[PDB]
Design a protein around this ligand. Sequence first.
Ligand SMILES: CC(=O)Nc1ccc(O)cc1
Length: 490
Amino acid sequence: SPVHWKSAAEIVELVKSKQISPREVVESTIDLIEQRDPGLNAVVYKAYDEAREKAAALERRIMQGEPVGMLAGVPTLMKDLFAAKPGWPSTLGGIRALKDARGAAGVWSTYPLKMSGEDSLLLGQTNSPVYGFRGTTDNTFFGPTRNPFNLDFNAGGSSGGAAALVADGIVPVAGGTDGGGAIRIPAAWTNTYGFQPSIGRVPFKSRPNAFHPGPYLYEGPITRTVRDAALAMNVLHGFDRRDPASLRVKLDFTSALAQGVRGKKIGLTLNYGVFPVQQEIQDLIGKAARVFTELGAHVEFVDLGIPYSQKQMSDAWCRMIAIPTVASMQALRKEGIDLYGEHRADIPDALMKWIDAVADISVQQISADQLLRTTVFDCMNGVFDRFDLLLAPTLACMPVRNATDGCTEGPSQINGEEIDPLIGWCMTYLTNFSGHPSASVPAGLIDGLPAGMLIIGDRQADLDVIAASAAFERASPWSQYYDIPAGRPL
Ligand SMILES: CC(=O)Nc1ccc(O)cc1
């Protein structure tokens, strides 16, 4: 294959130097998807002819010396969760009742708009759980997205299809969305790099309600290299007056790749003082943290002092996400797609529990959750009063086995403590409360399966996160572990 395992940086140079046509990039990527995706079950929509059309036009511009974009010829896919691209489907993570829906003219999600704007080629959409409402990827319409490191296990979620394609070498970058960790969760379970930007760094369009009570929502890349993530972030970030959090700031993310971390003060936590975390993960992260000490950074353990239990916090997150989920379900029912009645089977019971719970949620309850959120925000800020960076495990547990009922979920206990199987073990959701940028960096393998370390920066310190990530990547590479999916039976 001319493109299998090639980086985005490599493909851009192959295309711009005219070593390979955009046409061949598309046909070769299609070959890989048809050959390798049957096992992964990561792709839920194929836009092959559209990509072929775009490649023909890109090829003409290249041969004629007309202007081309920063990501010219890079193949990618977007996530099927609140997906908006004209003419494309949007099933909200495998809701069968929505299978015939198609995007209206002029309405775009950020990832497909901006990536295609710089001449990346969109080949289709990737699998997500229903309404993104769990840290695994499975649903009863498309099924589970499986882990390239072991297909008996789940890829993670909700951006599981995105991470699976990237970890299997099929595309160098894929788009994720993140409301409780969905860029970072599947990255951790698949040995890939998931970058969740500062709130307001990448435009997020929430309509009809831009002022909803949900957590911070992000769009961001999943890649195999930090450089590819920096390139994608150069495209994705930027001012958009229609996002009420948007930052009117221009950055060069590639400028941070060679910065290093010498002299940086780094805080370390193994469980944020409140989560049950599998011991093997704690040990791996303790080792990973010491990589920064060899690089000239000063690392020490920190206590965030979070006064809430992890169950209180996951319950609050579920209610926060459920309110806009309910708004969507009510809107759909008004347009003739009734997920409460006729198509109730399309909604997982675990989700409907929260849908029912917030149907007439009181202002007192809304307020209590906002107070919790504020407390977590301030606990995070307390760290960045004194430290440059915070390190933690991305997740409290290793990948789970796929179920056969379309409802793969996480564990309901870790170390004998009860934990919410949908999101409780996804410690990532703290930054959806707080707004800080963070990235999941591959920390190694435990019994042949990947585990991630989360690097968190100060508010708007995206470049610090990139700098630390690239430094770690150099000193503690993870690319060798791709030998496992590269050699898997097809
Ligand atoms: C795990 C997670 O982030 N889920 C999720 C992602 C996007 C969204 O809009 C709602 C929920």
